[PDB]
Amino acid sequence: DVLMTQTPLSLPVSLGDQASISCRSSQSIVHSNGNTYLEWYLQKPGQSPKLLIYKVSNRFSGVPDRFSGSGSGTDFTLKISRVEAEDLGVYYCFQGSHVPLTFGAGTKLEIKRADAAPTVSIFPPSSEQLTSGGASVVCFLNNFYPKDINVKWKIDGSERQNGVLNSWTDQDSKDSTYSMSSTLTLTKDEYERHNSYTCEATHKTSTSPIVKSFNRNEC
Amino acid sequence: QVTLKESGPGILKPSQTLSLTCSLSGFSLRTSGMGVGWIRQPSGKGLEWLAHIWWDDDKNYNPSLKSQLTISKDTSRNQVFLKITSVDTADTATYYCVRRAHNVLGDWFAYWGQGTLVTVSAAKTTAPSVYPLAPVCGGTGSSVTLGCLVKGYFPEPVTLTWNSGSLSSGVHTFPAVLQSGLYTLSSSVTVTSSTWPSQSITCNVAHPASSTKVDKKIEPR
Ligand SMILES: [Cl-]
Numbered sequence: 001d002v003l004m005t006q007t008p009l010s011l012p013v014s015l016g017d018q019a020s021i022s023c024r025s026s027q028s029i030v031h032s033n034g035n036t037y038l039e040w041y042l043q044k045p046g047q048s049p050k051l052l053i054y055k056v057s058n059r060f061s062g063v064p065d066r067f068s069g070s071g072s073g074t075d076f077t078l079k080i081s082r083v084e085a086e087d088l089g090v091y092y093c094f095q096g097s098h099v100p101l102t103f104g105a106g107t108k109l110e111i112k113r114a115d116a117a118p119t120v121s122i123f124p125p126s127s128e129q130l131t132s133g134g135a136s137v138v139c140f141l142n143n144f145y146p147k148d149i150n151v152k153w154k155i156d157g158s159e160r161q162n163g164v165l166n167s168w169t170d171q172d173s174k175d176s177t178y179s180m181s182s183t184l185t186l187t188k189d190e191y192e193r194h195n196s197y198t199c200e201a202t203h204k205t206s207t208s209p210i211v212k213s214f215n216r217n218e219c
Numbered sequence: 220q221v222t223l224k225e226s227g228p229g230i231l232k233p234s235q236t237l238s239l240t241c242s243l244s245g246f247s248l249r250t251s252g253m254g255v256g257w258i259r260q261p262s263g264k265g266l267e268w269l270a271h272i273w274w275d276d277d278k279n280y281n282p283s284l285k286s287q288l289t290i291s292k293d294t295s296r297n298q299v300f301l302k303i304t305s306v307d308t309a310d311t312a313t314y315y316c317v318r319r320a321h322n323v324l325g326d327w328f329a330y331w332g333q334g335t336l337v338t339v340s341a342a343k344t345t346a347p348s349v350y351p352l353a354p355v356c357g358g359t360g361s362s363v364t365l366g367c368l369v370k371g372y373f374p375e376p377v378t379l380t381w382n383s384g385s386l387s388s389g390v391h392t393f394p395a396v397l398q399s400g401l402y403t404l405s406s407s408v409t410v411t412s413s414t415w416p417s418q419s420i421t422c423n424v425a426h427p428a429s430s431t432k433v434d435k436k437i438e439p440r
Contacts, residue, residue: 048315
C-alpha cells in the first residue's frame with residue numbers, strides 16, 4: 001500500500017501566522033490517466049471531515065484563497081496564510097490514485113498561547129465507592145498550556161505506574177488551554193494498605209512539580 | 220442537498236456480522252460513473268478507507284480486510300450496503316458513507332455522511348455508579364474544585380450537568396476511558412470559595428441506554 005506520511009503531527013500557530021503541512025507519499029500518486037488524485041481534508045470535533053483541496057491544488061467550494069495546495073509526484077504541501085480560528089482542527093492528506101486508498105495520520109492545527117500552569121486538585125475515593133468495595137483516586141490538571149504535561153502518582157513515596165488511566169480535553173475555545181484527568185484505580189484492599197497519596201504535575205522542561213497530596217491518617 | 224445516511228445496529232458482539240446501509244438522495248447510483256463507499260474512524264484515531272462500489276457494480280476493497288468485507292448495492296432503492304463478518308473490539312469506530320464519482324465533477328470526497336458509531340463489545344448494558352469528588356479538608360485559596368466520577372457503565376453515551384445546567388462556566392467533562400469492557404468518565408467544576416459549601420453543588424448524570432438518571436450532591440468532608 002502507498003503510505004502517506006504527514007509532517008508535523010501537531011502544529012501550534014498564532015492567529016495571523018502561516019501554517020505549512022507536508023504530505024509525502026511512499027510511491028508516485030500519478031494515476032494511470034495522468035492525474036494526481038491528492039486531496040486535503042479538515043475535521044473538527046464531532047463532525048465529518050470536510051474537503052478543502054482536490055487534485056493537489058484546486059480549492060473546493062467555500063475554501064478561502066488563504067489555503068493553497070501544491071506539489072507533484074511524491075511531495076505535497078498545504079499552506080494556510082493568516083490562520084483564523086475557523087481553520088483550527090485536524091488536517092488529513094489522502095491519495096485516491098492507488099487501491100487501497102490511504103489517508104495521512106493527521107496534523108492537529110491548534111492555537112499557540114502563553115505557557116500556563118495547571119490548577120491541580122486531588123480527590124480520595126468517596127465513601128460511596130469504598131462501601132461498594134472500590135477505590136479510585138482522581139487528580140484534575142486543569143487549564144494548562146502546552147498540551148503535553150506529565151503526571152506522576154506516588155503511594156507512600158513509591159511512584160506507581162499501574163492502574164493509572166488518563167483523559168484529555170480538546171483545546172478550550174475561550175482560553176486556548178488544555179485540561180486532563182488522571183485516575184488511579186486500586187482494589188479497596190490495596191488502597192487501605194497505604195497512607196500517603198500524591199499527584200505531581202510536571203510541565204515541559206520543569207524542574208518544579210506542582211504537588212497535591214493527602215494522607216489517610218488525617219482524612 | 221446531495222446527502223448520505225448511515226443506518227444499522229450500533230452495538231454488536233465479537234464474532235458477529237456488522238451490517239450497515241447507506242441511503243442516498245440528491246443523486247442516482249445509476250448515473251455513469253457514480254460511486255459510493257465507506258471510511259471508518261476509531262475514537263481518537265485517523266481515517267481508514269474500507270471499500271467502494273460503482274454504478275456498474277465494480278467494487279474496490281481494502282486488502283487488509285478482504286476476507287471480511289462485502290459491499291453491495293440496490294440500484295432500485297438507491298442504497299449501498301456494507302457487511303463486515305467476524306468483527307472484534309477493534310472494529311469499534313465511526314463508520315462513514317462517502318460519495319466518489321469518476322470521469323468530471325468527481326474524484327473527491329466532497330460528500331460525506333454524518334457517520335454512525337458502531338461499538339463491538341461483549342459487555343452487557345450497565346447503569347453507571349456515580350461518585351462525588353469533594354476536596355480534602357482542608358485543601359485549602361480563591362477557588363475550590365469539585366468533581367463527579369461516573370464509573371462502570373455500558374454503552375456510550377452518558378450526559379452530565381452541574382446544578383441542572385446553571386453551572387456551565389468552569390466545568391471540564393473528560394472523555395470516557397474503557398476499563399474493560401466498561402466506561403468511566405469524570406467531570407470537574409470550579410467555583411469561588413464563597414460559593415461552596417454554603418450553596419449546594421449537584422452532579423446530574425443521565426444514561427439513556429439504561430434509562431437511568433441520577434443526581435449526586437457534593438457534600439463537604
Ligand atoms: Cl463525487
